[PDB]
Structures are given as C-alpha cells and as structure tokens.
Amino acid sequence: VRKQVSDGVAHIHASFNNTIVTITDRQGNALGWATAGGSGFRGSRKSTPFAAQVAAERCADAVKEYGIKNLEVMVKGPGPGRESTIRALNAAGFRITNITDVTPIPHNGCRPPKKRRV
Amino acid sequence: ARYLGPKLKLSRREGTDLFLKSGVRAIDTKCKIEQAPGQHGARKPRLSDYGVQLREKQKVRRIYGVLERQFRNYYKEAARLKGNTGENLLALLEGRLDNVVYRMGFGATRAEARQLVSHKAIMVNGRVVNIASYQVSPNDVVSIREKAKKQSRVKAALELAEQREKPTWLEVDAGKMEGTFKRKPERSDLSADINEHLIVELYSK
RNA sequence: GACACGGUCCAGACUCCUACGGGAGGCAGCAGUGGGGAAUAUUGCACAAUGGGCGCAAGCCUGAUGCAGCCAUGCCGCGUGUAUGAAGAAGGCCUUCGGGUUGUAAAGUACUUUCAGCGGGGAGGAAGGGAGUAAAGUUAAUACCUUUGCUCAUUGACGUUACCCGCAGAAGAAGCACCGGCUAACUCCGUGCCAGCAGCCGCGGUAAUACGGAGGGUGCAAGCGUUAAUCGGAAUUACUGGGC
RNA sequence: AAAUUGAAGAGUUUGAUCAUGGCUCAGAUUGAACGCUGGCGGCAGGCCUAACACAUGCAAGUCGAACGGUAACAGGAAGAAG
Ligand SMILES: [Mg+2]
Ligand SMILES: [Mg+2]
Ligand SMILES: [Mg+2]
Ligand SMILES: [Mg+2]
Ligand SMILES: [Mg+2]
Ligand SMILES: [Mg+2]
Ligand SMILES: [Mg+2]
Ligand SMILES: [Mg+2]
Ligand SMILES: [Mg+2]
Ligand SMILES: [Mg+2]
Ligand SMILES: [Mg+2]
Ligand SMILES: [Mg+2]
C-alpha cells in the first residue's frame, strides 16, 4: 500500500498572497503538499518568505512514504518565496538537480484585470 | 547458469546503479553507494584501459543477466547482421523474453520477471514459452497466462511499472494484462550511458 | 561386373581340434575379448520408416538403417528460487580500537513451483499391403487379370514417446581458477634464499599485495583449470609485406 | 534488395635512450587427456595407439509361379478299427 519512489519534482506556486509547495513524481502524480496558510500563518504572515520556508518543513514528510532524495524544482509566480523555500529543501536533506522558472508568461493573451486605483 | 549471490554487492560495484532490485525501497538506504565492496574498497582505484572495457562489458551483462558464452553468441550474431553492431547487440539483448516481460511491467525485477517466464506463466501468441532467451519479434502480442494473473506479485509489478517511463516500442495493457512488441527499440531510448563502440572493440580484440 | 572382406587353389606364419589317420580358422562388418596407450561407448532394440537382395505377389532376408545405452567429450538450452527484509543480527576477518568488512548476505516474512518428484492423459512419425467390393481397360467368354474408386480390419523398434494436465513443497540441484607486473581483482597470519611459486618478468635472506593459511575480492560457470596440438599476434621467410 | 567488410598489442637486452633481433603473453580452435567439481534436457561425436592378436553370436540371402521332391507340418479322401 504505502509505496516508495525517488526522482521527484517540486512545483512552487509563488503567488503574491500565498506559497504552494507540492512534491510530485516525474509524471505529475502528487505525493505531498504543504501551504503557508496551513502552517499556522494568516494575513501578512501567509506571504512572507519565512513562512514559505516553514511550509517546506511540513513537506519534509513523505520521507518513508517516498524516498525522493533527488528532486526537480519548478517555480512559477512572482510573489515572495522564490528563494526561501528553495533553501529549506536543501536543509531538509534533498538533492536539488535543476532549478527552472515555469512562470506563465502570455504573449499578449487574455486581458488582465484593471488597475487598483486604491 | 544464473547469479545467485547478493545483489547490492554488484550494484555498488561498477558504480552507477543500473536497473537492479525491486526498485521501490531507496537504493541508497539498502547499501553504501560510491564504495566498491571489499575491505580495501574504501580507496580510489586508478583504473586502467583493460579495466574500463571490462567494467562496461560486465555492467551490460548484469543489467540483462547474460552469461559470457551467451553474450558472445549475441556479439557474433550482431557482427553478422547488417548495420552498426553495437545497437544491433543492444536490440538483441532488449528482445529477450525475460527483459521484455520486465519492461512490460509484469515483474518487479528482471530476475523475478524471468522467474515468471521460467515457471511457465507467460503466453506468447497462444503458445507457452518458458525460455527467457526467446527472441520476441515485432508486432507480437504477449499475454499473461490466465492462471498466472491470479498471482498478486504480478499485479503489484504492474503498479510499479508506471514510474518507469513506459518504453515507446512497447504497448502495455493494464487490465488487459497484455503487451504488443510494436517494433525493435532504438539507441536513443536506451540509457545514453552505454558506449556500444567500446563493447565492439573489446570483443574484436 | 572380382583376380572377390564373411568364394576357391597354393605357399608362409600363427590359431584350434582329432580317436594321430587328419582336419578346420582369419572381427581393417556389429557388439566384444586381451594387449597397447595419457585416452575413446552396449556382447542393446526393431526392421515400425527408409534403403537394398530374392520373389508375380504375399512375403523372407538387413549389426545397412532407424532407435536406445555409456562419457559434461563438444555445441545449445535450462534450473539450482522471487520480493521484502539493518538496532547493518551474530559470527568471520581487519582495525586508527573508534570502527569498518562480510552484507539484505542471513535469519525472518510474504511469494512461486521450471525441470527433476509423482500421478493422469496424448500427437506425430504411418506410407503401406491384405481382405473385400463395384465399375472401367483388358475378352471367345469383357471369365483371367489390371486400373480406378470405394468397404472392413489393419501394422511404431523407439515408447512409461513430442506434448498436455493435476499433485506437493524452496523444497532435490555451484563449483573452479585467479587477485606482483603483463592482466580484472588485497590485506592479515605463518615462513625466513628455508619451504616453496614460476607463461614472461621474477619472488623468498625476519614488517612476503608473488610462497603457505585466513578473510576479502576478480573472472568463468555445470563446468573451471593444467597439459598437448594448429593458426593468429609473428611485417619473425615479407607475393601482397623485410633486409644486406 | 541481400549475399564485396575488415586488419589492436604487451612484457623482457640499458644507469637511462633509440634500433635491430629474439623468446614470452593475451585470441581463436580439437576425433583431446588429466585434476577438481558436477542438476537436467536437446543436438552432435566417441581406439588418433598395435592393418596387433582375437573367446563367442550376428552382419546374404531368397525364389515351389524353374524342377525332380515331400524331409516336417497342416489339412484332405479312402480304408478300417475298442
Ligand atoms: Mg565377398
Ligand atoms: Mg571378416
Ligand atoms: Mg569390432
Ligand atoms: Mg527381436
Ligand atoms: Mg539383427
Ligand atoms: Mg518435472
Ligand atoms: Mg590489476
Ligand atoms: Mg553451458
Ligand atoms: Mg600453446
Ligand atoms: Mg608472415
Ligand atoms: Mg628487419
Ligand atoms: Mg541372421
């Protein structure tokens, strides 16, 4: 039942309000995830780079469930947390092989929301 | 006619882990990689020229459990056949029934999938074959024997097959418990860490 | 069709028998015996098939031939399990005395039963002729035949066959050579130019990666080694392809 | 279509070098043997020695539709019989 597998990939959704850390295999089947909002951080605390690192600490689970060891890194989103989280993976005992940005950049696609006059 | 000793010893020797053991439990945990066996293994061995050639040949053989005598017969056939010999030799090694069953996903290990073939549990084109070295020809359909399917080990091996990027030239069937050896494999698909030109020279010496 | 392997005549040697008067024999056919040598198989089965001889045929005749037995002698295939399994069990050996090493090897825990165990089925080799039939050709008579078709019953030495199916339980199945260089793979102990090894280079004279033992490791595998032999490498008799 | 296609060195002469020139090694391969070990099957092979001697059984017989025959058998009829 509880399986075991290495050579994963980590998808990083660095949004302006939250950071989503998901560890998955090479074929997109999710193995585990953790979020800043689910790590005890709300409001401003839910977006600070630090809390994003803390979210990674949670994702350090699945160890016995999946011996990922070496994993890929996918990063998308301009929000804070494009650096912190990455460190936490190293300090957790993981082999970061490649680091690439997968931020969606339209070539003049859909119309964006209007500006916040505030 | 078969290797029966420990497996992690060979794995950690010759260095790069290449398709051994069930494939679930992390390879590093079971042993100590980057350290050849033996009391003196913890040292840097200045390999030679013969050394490199020998290692490659030994490595290739173990990946497919082919004994020298057998492997040499493949080399003679590969040289006889038209085309580049090294890829032809690799194609012949991949075309063995036991290897194909392993890649098809019915066995956790090449040895276990080979045992499934040996124990008369595999059907090819409606004919019972229990010879691991049988050469599968293109467009053939390999189907697990009705009785065999009741083995829960086969079922679990299917599950794990998902992690290995399904070989293109093999059309695997899940619940259908069948496979179609579409065509011969190509060098590109095979692990790019194999230098077949080294193998060709070594046996041509 | 022979100067004739199981024909004859003669001579020679040997072989054996005889009632002494006289005879008989020739496995370089198949088994086999002794001998020789390092070293080569069962005094097997059946003519079922093929093949040949004779016979109208039916047949009979086959140590030809088909099979079987023996030897790992070679070639080829196969199996001796599969996964889990680390407080890296103990034990072994090393040890910088901290450890490491064996080794996930084991044990254990799931799992499977190839072949070998046993049991029960079951092709193919099998074509044939015979007995009949009916018609046809064949006649004086289409009697005789011979040609068809058919009909019945047929024959397998191998053979407890090829193969299939069930039975049970990892149970019954791994050695051999090497680890100084060439040449892949190392230390410890013993020994002290002793004993020894040695394809070449050479080791050993008291801290031997070379001998001997231990652990470990490398190659190959139901085989691994040694020896003998042929070619290669050896452009080292060179025509390709050499020199003085 | 295809059947034309493959060609490696190394160690040893010296204080060191080049050169000629040996020997030796790796590779194939056998109608092999010996040693150690040895589960099974398929296929092939198996006195290279003394054409040395050979115990013994067998390896060329068949044909009655060539003929005198009927030795042995089967029946067959006669003749008889408790
Ligand atoms: Mg004659
Ligand atoms: Mg004779
Ligand atoms: Mg004889
Ligand atoms: Mg008889
Ligand atoms: Mg006879
Ligand atoms: Mg059996
Ligand atoms: Mg070496
Ligand atoms: Mg073999
Ligand atoms: Mg020789
Ligand atoms: Mg020459
Ligand atoms: Mg010269
Ligand atoms: Mg006779």
Side-chain angles (χ1 to χ4, degrees):
Chain A
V1 186
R2 189 235 50 183
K3 320 91 181 183
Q4 283 173 4
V5 55
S6 61
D7 190 4
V9 54
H11 288 90
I12 287 295
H13 182 82
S15 68
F16 279 121
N17 305 348
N18 194 7
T19 315
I20 301 299
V21 181
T22 80
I23 307 166
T24 180
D25 64 357
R26 305 293 308 298
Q27 290 298 291
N29 313 75
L31 319 173
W33 58 268
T35 75
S39 178
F41 302 87
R42 293 312 308 179
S44 187
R45 311 180 178 177
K46 197 193 62 176
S47 181
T48 178
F50 168 84
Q53 168 190 6
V54 183
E57 310 307 298
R58 300 180 56 210
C59 276
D61 300 3
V63 286
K64 312 305 177 180
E65 290 68 17
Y66 318 94
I68 295 308
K69 305 320 164 191
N70 55 339
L71 52 82
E72 290 292 6
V73 159
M74 304 312 174
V75 175
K76 65 162 49 181
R82 301 174 53 89
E83 326 295 335
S84 59
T85 51
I86 303 297
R87 320 313 296 205
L89 275 291
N90 183 291
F94 278 137
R95 310 308 314 286
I96 300 90
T97 74
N98 311 322
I99 43 178
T100 174
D101 58 355
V102 182
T103 301
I105 182 65
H107 299 350
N108 280 141
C110 279
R111 191 196 170 107
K114 65 180 186 176
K115 272 200 171 180
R116 289 183 51 187
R117 281 160 295 181
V118 165
Chain B
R2 313 199 318 100
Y3 177 71
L4 301 174
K7 309 179 182 305
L8 271 289
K9 183 195 307 302
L10 315 186
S11 296
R12 70 181 193 177
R13 170 89 68 180
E14 88 182 17
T16 67
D17 52 294
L18 283 184
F19 293 107
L20 268 289
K21 291 298 284 177
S22 63
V24 188
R25 155 149 200 173
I27 51 177
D28 52 4
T29 68
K30 295 192 53 55
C31 70
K32 187 191 304 178
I33 307 295
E34 303 179 6
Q35 173 158 327
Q39 295 189 357
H40 306 107
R43 74 185 195 181
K44 165 261 182 181
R46 176 172 41 90
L47 197 57
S48 60
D49 193 346
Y50 172 49
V52 300
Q53 317 177 9
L54 172 61
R55 291 306 80 188
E56 178 70 350
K57 192 274 299 181
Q58 293 291 165
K59 187 162 60 61
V60 172
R61 277 181 48 186
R62 303 168 193 181
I63 304 173
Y64 305 78
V66 193
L67 295 174
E68 178 79 358
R69 188 62 55 190
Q70 302 265 345
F71 194 85
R72 171 218 64 170
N73 298 333
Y74 285 101
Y75 167 77
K76 272 166 167 88
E77 193 58 286
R80 182 259 189 207
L81 295 152
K82 326 191 168 284
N84 279 27
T85 61
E87 308 74 357
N88 286 335
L89 177 137
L90 291 163
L92 290 182
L93 293 172
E94 192 279 331
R96 289 171 54 223
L97 183 50
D98 54 4
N99 166 78
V100 161
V101 172
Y102 165 82
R103 313 212 180 172
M104 214 60 69
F106 312 122
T109 61
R110 286 169 193 249
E112 179 176 79
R114 189 207 196 262
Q115 164 157 283
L116 268 296
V117 175
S118 173
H119 281 216
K120 281 203 175 182
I122 316 285
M123 188 67 72
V124 71
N125 285 3
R127 293 167 79 71
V128 165
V129 175
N130 70 324
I131 300 191
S133 297
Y134 175 41
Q135 287 323 280
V136 300
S137 306
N139 302 115
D140 197 297
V141 175
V142 59
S143 55
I144 298 297
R145 298 187 60 179
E146 311 71 22
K147 172 53 181 301
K149 293 179 179 179
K150 199 63 178 182
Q151 295 192 7
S152 61
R153 53 174 184 179
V154 194
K155 305 173 57 180
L158 267 295
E159 189 286 303
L160 184 83
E162 183 178 2
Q163 292 290 353
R164 306 181 292 241
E165 180 273 346
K166 305 184 179 303
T168 74
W169 66 106
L170 300 179
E171 279 162 357
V172 176
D173 310 346
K176 173 53 59 181
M177 294 300 293
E178 289 185 5
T180 301
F181 176 72
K182 301 174 49 182
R183 46 174 168 79
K184 298 296 289 184
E186 279 60 43
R187 181 53 194 90
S188 300
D189 306 330
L190 316 178
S191 193
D193 72 334
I194 306 294
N195 57 5
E196 52 82 7
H197 58 303
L198 184 159
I199 287 302
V200 176
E201 59 83 27
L202 168 78
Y203 274 11
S204 72
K205 185 178 179 181

